[PDB]
Design an enzyme around this catalytic site. Structure first.
Site, PDB file in Angstrom:
ATOM      1  N   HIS B  40       0.505  -0.993  -0.407  1.00 34.55           N
ATOM      2  CA  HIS B  40      -0.167   0.199   0.204  1.00 34.55           C
ATOM      3  C   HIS B  40       0.736   1.641   0.073  1.00 34.55           C
ATOM      4  O   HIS B  40       0.366   2.592  -0.345  1.00 34.55           O
ATOM      5  CB  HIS B  40      -0.981   0.009   1.515  1.00 34.55           C
ATOM      6  CG  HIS B  40      -0.736  -0.007   3.027  1.00 34.55           C
ATOM      7  ND1 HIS B  40       0.035  -0.862   3.416  1.00 34.55           N
ATOM      8  CD2 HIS B  40      -0.266   1.376   3.413  1.00 34.55           C
ATOM      9  CE1 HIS B  40       0.302  -0.548   4.395  1.00 34.55           C
ATOM     10  NE2 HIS B  40       0.155   0.675   4.737  1.00 34.55           N
ATOM     11  N   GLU B  62      24.379   9.022   3.542  1.00 34.44           N
ATOM     12  CA  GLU B  62      23.458   9.254   3.000  1.00 34.44           C
ATOM     13  C   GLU B  62      23.816   8.124   1.713  1.00 34.44           C
ATOM     14  O   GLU B  62      24.507   8.594   0.948  1.00 34.44           O
ATOM     15  CB  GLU B  62      22.110  10.666   2.529  1.00 34.44           C
ATOM     16  CG  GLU B  62      21.827  11.192   3.558  1.00 34.44           C
ATOM     17  CD  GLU B  62      22.403  12.362   4.480  1.00 34.44           C
ATOM     18  OE1 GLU B  62      23.733  11.773   3.908  1.00 34.44           O
ATOM     19  OE2 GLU B  62      22.410  13.007   5.100  1.00 34.44           O
ATOM     20  N   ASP B  84       0.450  -7.928   2.073  1.00 34.82           N
ATOM     21  CA  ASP B  84       0.647  -6.678   2.323  1.00 34.82           C
ATOM     22  C   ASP B  84       2.350  -6.447   1.892  1.00 34.82           C
ATOM     23  O   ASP B  84       2.908  -5.891   2.962  1.00 34.82           O
ATOM     24  CB  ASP B  84       0.496  -6.143   3.159  1.00 34.82           C
ATOM     25  CG  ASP B  84       0.875  -4.092   2.836  1.00 34.82           C
ATOM     26  OD1 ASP B  84       0.532  -3.318   1.643  1.00 34.82           O
ATOM     27  OD2 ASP B  84       0.109  -3.455   4.570  1.00 34.82           O
ATOM     28  N   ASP B 171       3.560   1.886  19.876  1.00 31.54           N
ATOM     29  CA  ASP B 171       2.602   1.711  18.979  1.00 31.54           C
ATOM     30  C   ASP B 171       3.398   1.743  17.455  1.00 31.54           C
ATOM     31  O   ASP B 171       4.450   3.202  17.897  1.00 31.54           O
ATOM     32  CB  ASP B 171       1.593   1.667  18.663  1.00 31.54           C
ATOM     33  CG  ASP B 171       1.193   0.533  17.600  1.00 31.54           C
ATOM     34  OD1 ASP B 171       1.568   0.207  16.708  1.00 31.54           O
ATOM     35  OD2 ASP B 171      -0.335   0.545  17.630  1.00 31.54           O
ATOM     36  N   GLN B 174       1.115   6.427  11.357  1.00 33.67           N
ATOM     37  CA  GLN B 174       0.712   7.126  10.616  1.00 33.67           C
ATOM     38  C   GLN B 174       2.556   7.515  10.239  1.00 33.67           C
ATOM     39  O   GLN B 174       2.835   8.326  10.810  1.00 33.67           O
ATOM     40  CB  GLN B 174       0.085   7.920   9.420  1.00 33.67           C
ATOM     41  CG  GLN B 174      -1.641   7.026   9.641  1.00 33.67           C
ATOM     42  CD  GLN B 174      -2.202   6.307  11.004  1.00 33.67           C
ATOM     43  OE1 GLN B 174      -2.223   6.826  12.592  1.00 33.67           O
ATOM     44  NE2 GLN B 174      -2.625   5.025  11.012  1.00 33.67           N
ATOM     45  N   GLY B 175       3.482   6.905   8.642  1.00 32.00           N
ATOM     46  CA  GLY B 175       4.097   7.320   8.572  1.00 32.00           C
ATOM     47  C   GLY B 175       4.939   6.028   8.461  1.00 32.00           C
ATOM     48  O   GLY B 175       6.944   6.617   8.083  1.00 32.00           O
ATOM     49  N   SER B 177       4.364   3.094   7.858  1.00 32.95           N
ATOM     50  CA  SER B 177       4.467   2.030   6.940  1.00 32.95           C
ATOM     51  C   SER B 177       5.294   1.284   5.802  1.00 32.95           C
ATOM     52  O   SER B 177       6.128   2.134   5.781  1.00 32.95           O
ATOM     53  CB  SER B 177       3.202   2.123   5.907  1.00 32.95           C
ATOM     54  OG  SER B 177       1.888   1.936   6.184  1.00 32.95           O
ATOM     55  N   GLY B 178       5.235   0.365   6.318  1.00 36.19           N
ATOM     56  CA  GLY B 178       6.822  -0.356   5.032  1.00 36.19           C
ATOM     57  C   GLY B 178       8.165  -0.481   5.785  1.00 36.19           C
ATOM     58  O   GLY B 178       8.443  -1.517   5.151  1.00 36.19           O
TER      59      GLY B 178
HETATM   60 CA   LIG Z   1      20.385  12.684   5.926  1.00 32.14          CA
END
Ligand SMILES: [Ca+2]
Lengths: 34, 223
Positions: B40, B62, B84, B171, B174-175, B177-178
């Site tokens: 999703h 990065e 999912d 828990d 939202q944000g 996910s995945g």
């Molecule tokens: Ca950074």
């Protein structure tokens, strides 16, 4: 801009959604456009 | 992540941020060219961000790599949230190091009671909104299949498990996910869904990765 219900970025600009609001999904752990 | 703690820079080196401008989902690096996430979380033009801590400030560790392929599980059911899971191929192989590393696929499923590490840049509040700069972490046990099905009667498939706390307060949110659920060095779960965040009797529900090892292997081998 994205339709209501489409995935969006929580910390993004609200204009990413046509509705002008990116909100938590109640079930999925993503944000979606209002 | 609600009720969690600051992981520490690059202490979760398999954690990636899925980006289309800004962060929208988590994911897990499973080898130099492949990321596991939630189905999703699918969208076009995904950029994968590795070696991230503070997602707002370039800190020097990065890597920014475009997705070349984003493969949703072909049996993903958007109605039941079954299957999912999504596989993202990187345009180029990531440079693996101490701060950018892959997480192992499980050889067997994990048991109830096993403490796992869940992480992400998602919401830190159960009511309202608050976006962290840096990666947040949460220790959570896997719940029994019975307690999971009691929490979400008629909604838990054999490809899901609950983890977290029935008392709420802690828990994924939202944000997130995945993102990864890692147990004893193995990627066992993918942040998927729940009823709100950190609500009483509504723990997080996660994609059961150990049931997808063959699909993952086949997909990699053929792409
Ligand atoms: Ca950074």
């Amino acid at each position: 801009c994205s339709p209501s219900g489409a995935i969006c970025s929580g910390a993004g600009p609200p204009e990413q959604c046509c509705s002008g609001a990116c909100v938590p999904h109640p079930i999925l752990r993503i944000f979606v456009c209002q | 992540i609600v009720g969690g703690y600051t992981c520490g820079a690059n202490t979760v080196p398999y954690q990636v941020s899925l980006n289309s401008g800004y962060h929208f989902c988590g994911g897990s690096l499973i080898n130099s060219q492949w990321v596991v996430s939630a189905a999703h979380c699918y969208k076009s033009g995904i950029q994968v961000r590795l070696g991230e801590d503070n997602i707002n400030v370039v800190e020097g560790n990065e890597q920014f790599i475009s997705a070349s392929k984003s493969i949703v599980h072909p049996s993903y059911n958007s109605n039941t949230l079954n299957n999912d899971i999504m596989l993202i191929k990187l345009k180029s192989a990531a440079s693996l190091n101490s701060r950018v590393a892959s997480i192992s696929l499980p050889t067997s499923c994990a048991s109830a009671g096993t403490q796992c590490l869940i992480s992400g840049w998602g919401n830190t509040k159960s009511s309202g909104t608050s976006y962290p700069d840096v990666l947040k972490c949460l220790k959570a046990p896997i719940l029994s299949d019975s307690s999971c099905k009691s929490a979400y009667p008629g909604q838990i498939t054999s490809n899901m498990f609950c983890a977290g706390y029935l008392e709420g307060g802690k828990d994924s949110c939202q944000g997130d996910s995945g993102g990864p659920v890692v147990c004893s060095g193995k990627l066992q779960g993918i942040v998927s869904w729940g009823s709100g965040c950190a609500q009483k009797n509504k723990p997080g529900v996660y994609t059961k990765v150990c049931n997808y090892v063959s699909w993952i292997k086949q997909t990699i081998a053929s792409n």
